[PDB]
Design a protein around this motif. Structure first.
Motif, PDB file in Angstrom:
ATOM      1  N   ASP A  95      -9.549  34.087  25.431  1.00 42.54           N
ATOM      2  CA  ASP A  95     -10.904  34.402  25.857  1.00 42.54           C
ATOM      3  C   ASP A  95     -11.124  33.809  27.233  1.00 42.54           C
ATOM      4  O   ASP A  95     -10.730  32.682  27.479  1.00 42.54           O
ATOM      5  N   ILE A  96     -11.798  34.548  28.099  1.00 41.82           N
ATOM      6  CA  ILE A  96     -12.085  34.058  29.443  1.00 41.82           C
ATOM      7  C   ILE A  96     -13.549  33.648  29.657  1.00 41.82           C
ATOM      8  O   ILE A  96     -13.898  33.170  30.733  1.00 41.82           O
ATOM      9  N   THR A  97     -14.394  33.776  28.641  1.00 43.50           N
ATOM     10  CA  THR A  97     -15.809  33.423  28.831  1.00 43.50           C
ATOM     11  C   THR A  97     -16.000  31.930  29.094  1.00 43.50           C
ATOM     12  O   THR A  97     -15.413  31.105  28.413  1.00 43.50           O
ATOM     13  N   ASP A  98     -16.802  31.611  30.113  1.00 41.21           N
ATOM     14  CA  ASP A  98     -16.986  30.232  30.608  1.00 41.21           C
ATOM     15  C   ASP A  98     -15.683  29.573  31.036  1.00 41.21           C
ATOM     16  O   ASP A  98     -15.612  28.376  31.126  1.00 41.21           O
ATOM     17  N   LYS A  99     -14.646  30.354  31.309  1.00 43.14           N
ATOM     18  CA  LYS A  99     -13.428  29.817  31.911  1.00 43.14           C
ATOM     19  C   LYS A  99     -13.301  30.172  33.375  1.00 43.14           C
ATOM     20  O   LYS A  99     -14.008  31.066  33.867  1.00 43.14           O
ATOM     21  N   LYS A 100     -12.444  29.442  34.080  1.00 44.05           N
ATOM     22  CA  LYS A 100     -12.143  29.767  35.464  1.00 44.05           C
ATOM     23  C   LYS A 100     -10.892  30.614  35.484  1.00 44.05           C
ATOM     24  O   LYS A 100      -9.799  30.151  35.116  1.00 44.05           O
ATOM     25  N   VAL A 101     -11.066  31.873  35.845  1.00 44.55           N
ATOM     26  CA  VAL A 101      -9.973  32.791  35.918  1.00 44.55           C
ATOM     27  C   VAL A 101      -9.482  32.787  37.346  1.00 44.55           C
ATOM     28  O   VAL A 101     -10.287  32.976  38.276  1.00 44.55           O
ATOM     29  N   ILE A 102      -8.176  32.595  37.532  1.00 42.88           N
ATOM     30  CA  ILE A 102      -7.537  32.724  38.844  1.00 42.88           C
ATOM     31  C   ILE A 102      -6.751  34.001  38.912  1.00 42.88           C
ATOM     32  O   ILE A 102      -5.696  34.127  38.269  1.00 42.88           O
ATOM     33  N   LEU A 103      -7.238  34.939  39.722  1.00 42.96           N
ATOM     34  CA  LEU A 103      -6.582  36.189  39.925  1.00 42.96           C
ATOM     35  C   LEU A 103      -5.412  35.948  40.873  1.00 42.96           C
ATOM     36  O   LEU A 103      -5.518  35.155  41.813  1.00 42.96           O
ATOM     37  N   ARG A 115     -11.233  43.766  43.710  1.00 46.86           N
ATOM     38  CA  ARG A 115     -12.505  44.183  43.152  1.00 46.86           C
ATOM     39  C   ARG A 115     -12.319  44.813  41.770  1.00 46.86           C
ATOM     40  O   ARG A 115     -13.066  44.474  40.844  1.00 46.86           O
ATOM     41  N   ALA A 116     -11.360  45.732  41.614  1.00 50.11           N
ATOM     42  CA  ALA A 116     -11.096  46.279  40.281  1.00 50.11           C
ATOM     43  C   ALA A 116     -10.718  45.172  39.316  1.00 50.11           C
ATOM     44  O   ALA A 116     -11.123  45.203  38.157  1.00 50.11           O
ATOM     45  N   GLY A 117      -9.915  44.204  39.765  1.00 54.29           N
ATOM     46  CA  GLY A 117      -9.578  43.038  38.915  1.00 54.29           C
ATOM     47  C   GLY A 117     -10.792  42.265  38.423  1.00 54.29           C
ATOM     48  O   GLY A 117     -10.915  41.979  37.229  1.00 54.29           O
ATOM     49  N   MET A 118     -11.717  41.975  39.327  1.00 56.75           N
ATOM     50  CA  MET A 118     -12.954  41.308  38.953  1.00 56.75           C
ATOM     51  C   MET A 118     -13.747  42.091  37.929  1.00 56.75           C
ATOM     52  O   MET A 118     -14.202  41.507  36.969  1.00 56.75           O
ATOM     53  N   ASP A 119     -13.918  43.399  38.136  1.00 54.51           N
ATOM     54  CA  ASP A 119     -14.645  44.212  37.173  1.00 54.51           C
ATOM     55  C   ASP A 119     -13.917  44.237  35.839  1.00 54.51           C
ATOM     56  O   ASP A 119     -14.539  44.235  34.815  1.00 54.51           O
ATOM     57  N   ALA A 120     -12.593  44.313  35.858  1.00 53.64           N
ATOM     58  CA  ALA A 120     -11.821  44.363  34.620  1.00 53.64           C
ATOM     59  C   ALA A 120     -12.049  43.097  33.790  1.00 53.64           C
ATOM     60  O   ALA A 120     -12.178  43.172  32.580  1.00 53.64           O
ATOM     61  N   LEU A 121     -12.150  41.963  34.479  1.00 52.55           N
ATOM     62  CA  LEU A 121     -12.418  40.677  33.857  1.00 52.55           C
ATOM     63  C   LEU A 121     -13.780  40.688  33.235  1.00 52.55           C
ATOM     64  O   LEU A 121     -13.931  40.218  32.115  1.00 52.55           O
ATOM     65  N   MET A 122     -14.760  41.214  33.970  1.00 61.03           N
ATOM     66  CA  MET A 122     -16.142  41.274  33.517  1.00 61.03           C
ATOM     67  C   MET A 122     -16.302  42.173  32.306  1.00 61.03           C
ATOM     68  O   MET A 122     -17.240  41.958  31.499  1.00 61.03           O
ATOM     69  N   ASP A 123     -15.414  43.139  32.161  1.00 56.70           N
ATOM     70  CA  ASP A 123     -15.379  43.893  30.913  1.00 56.70           C
ATOM     71  C   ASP A 123     -14.818  43.109  29.730  1.00 56.70           C
ATOM     72  O   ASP A 123     -15.129  43.434  28.614  1.00 56.70           O
ATOM     73  N   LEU A 124     -14.011  42.087  29.949  1.00 55.76           N
ATOM     74  CA  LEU A 124     -13.472  41.314  28.824  1.00 55.76           C
ATOM     75  C   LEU A 124     -14.265  40.079  28.539  1.00 55.76           C
ATOM     76  O   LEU A 124     -14.052  39.438  27.545  1.00 55.76           O
ATOM     77  N   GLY A 125     -15.191  39.711  29.406  1.00 55.23           N
ATOM     78  CA  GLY A 125     -15.820  38.419  29.256  1.00 55.23           C
ATOM     79  C   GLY A 125     -16.667  37.963  30.415  1.00 55.23           C
ATOM     80  O   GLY A 125     -16.898  38.692  31.334  1.00 55.23           O
ATOM     81  N   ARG A 126     -17.100  36.726  30.354  1.00 51.96           N
ATOM     82  CA  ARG A 126     -18.042  36.196  31.307  1.00 51.96           C
ATOM     83  C   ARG A 126     -17.468  34.878  31.784  1.00 51.96           C
ATOM     84  O   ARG A 126     -17.925  33.809  31.359  1.00 51.96           O
ATOM     85  N   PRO A 127     -16.465  34.944  32.688  1.00 48.96           N
ATOM     86  CA  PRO A 127     -15.937  33.668  33.143  1.00 48.96           C
ATOM     87  C   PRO A 127     -16.931  32.882  33.985  1.00 48.96           C
ATOM     88  O   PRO A 127     -17.809  33.459  34.628  1.00 48.96           O
ATOM     89  N   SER A 128     -16.795  31.573  33.982  1.00 52.25           N
ATOM     90  CA  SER A 128     -17.649  30.772  34.839  1.00 52.25           C
ATOM     91  C   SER A 128     -17.330  30.976  36.310  1.00 52.25           C
ATOM     92  O   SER A 128     -18.204  30.841  37.126  1.00 52.25           O
ATOM     93  N   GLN A 129     -16.080  31.260  36.639  1.00 50.38           N
ATOM     94  CA  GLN A 129     -15.673  31.584  38.006  1.00 50.38           C
ATOM     95  C   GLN A 129     -14.489  32.524  37.966  1.00 50.38           C
ATOM     96  O   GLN A 129     -13.680  32.474  37.034  1.00 50.38           O
ATOM     97  N   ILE A 130     -14.407  33.366  38.995  1.00 55.44           N
ATOM     98  CA  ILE A 130     -13.161  34.046  39.340  1.00 55.44           C
ATOM     99  C   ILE A 130     -12.693  33.589  40.730  1.00 55.44           C
ATOM    100  O   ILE A 130     -13.407  33.729  41.736  1.00 55.44           O
ATOM    101  N   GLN A 131     -11.481  33.058  40.746  1.00 49.41           N
ATOM    102  CA  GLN A 131     -10.821  32.582  41.957  1.00 49.41           C
ATOM    103  C   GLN A 131      -9.688  33.519  42.288  1.00 49.41           C
ATOM    104  O   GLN A 131      -9.272  34.346  41.456  1.00 49.41           O
ATOM    105  N   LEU A 132      -9.207  33.435  43.517  1.00 52.54           N
ATOM    106  CA  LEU A 132      -8.174  34.340  43.930  1.00 52.54           C
ATOM    107  C   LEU A 132      -7.057  33.626  44.648  1.00 52.54           C
ATOM    108  O   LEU A 132      -7.282  33.005  45.685  1.00 52.54           O
ATOM    109  N   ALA A 133      -5.846  33.746  44.094  1.00 55.13           N
ATOM    110  CA  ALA A 133      -4.633  33.209  44.692  1.00 55.13           C
ATOM    111  C   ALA A 133      -3.785  34.364  45.182  1.00 55.13           C
ATOM    112  O   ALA A 133      -3.560  35.350  44.457  1.00 55.13           O
ATOM    113  N   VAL A 134      -3.319  34.269  46.426  1.00 59.61           N
ATOM    114  CA  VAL A 134      -2.515  35.321  46.998  1.00 59.61           C
ATOM    115  C   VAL A 134      -1.377  34.709  47.764  1.00 59.61           C
ATOM    116  O   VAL A 134      -1.526  33.678  48.444  1.00 59.61           O
TER     117      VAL A 134
END
Length: 180
Positions: A95-103, A115-134
């Motif tokens: 579960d990603i709700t209230d978690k920090k997801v690092i894309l 952006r599609a990644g962020m929306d896809a996450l929002m369809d599975l849950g409500r993380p406290s943050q989405i971060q991005l590693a590249v």
């Protein structure tokens, strides 16, 4: 032509950037409690799995890893980088709700996959943050997106394409830039 490809991350630079990103994630999040890594694109996913192993070697705690499976399309007949993400599926083992997801993206370019990644996450849950590693940020953002963690900034023109090879899919680790 000749000299119309160059290596922008050789294998060692790849491994060093991953290791840097692992440390940066840990420092910024003050540990990896409640962190989840999620790979976007086939190579983003393999990178995510390397990153979680590295973080595990540093912290001694496993980090879960998921994936968002995205294919990119164009609306026209141009040969130029595909810019329309279609999300084919997701598999996040926790579960990603209230978690920090690092894309985790191999190359940040337009931001459109992110952006599609962020929306896809929002369809599975409500993380406290989405971060991005590249691994690479090549600029030319088309959306107001930026990475929290960047292996290397690589200035590019829109005529160039970045080719990422990794052992898991391409039998070698190398990032290259190509004209055309």
């Amino acid at each position: 032509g000749s000299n119309e490809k160059a290596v922008i991350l050789d294998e060692q630079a790849i491994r060093r950037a991953l290791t840097r990103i692992a440390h940066e994630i840990i420092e910024r999040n003050k540990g990896v409690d409640n962190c989840v890594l999620v790979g976007i694109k086939t190579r983003g996913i393999y990178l995510a799995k390397r990153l979680a192993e590295r973080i595990e070697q540093i912290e001694g705690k496993p980090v879960p890893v998921g994936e968002i499976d995205i294919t990119l399309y164009r609306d026209d007949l141009s040969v130029t980088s595909n810019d329309e993400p279609l999300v084919k599926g997701t598999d996040i083992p926790v579960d990603i709700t209230d978690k920090k997801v690092i894309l985790v993206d191999d190359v940040l370019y337009t931001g459109r996959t992110v952006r599609a990644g962020m929306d896809a996450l929002m369809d599975l849950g409500r993380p406290s943050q989405i971060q991005l590693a590249v691994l690479v940020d090549r600029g030319h953002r088309e959306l107001p997106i930026r990475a929290d963690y960047v292996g290397k900034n690589v200035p590019t023109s829109k005529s160039e394409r970045i080719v990422v090879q990794l052992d898991e899919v391409d039998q070698n680790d190398r990032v290259s830039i190509y004209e055309n």
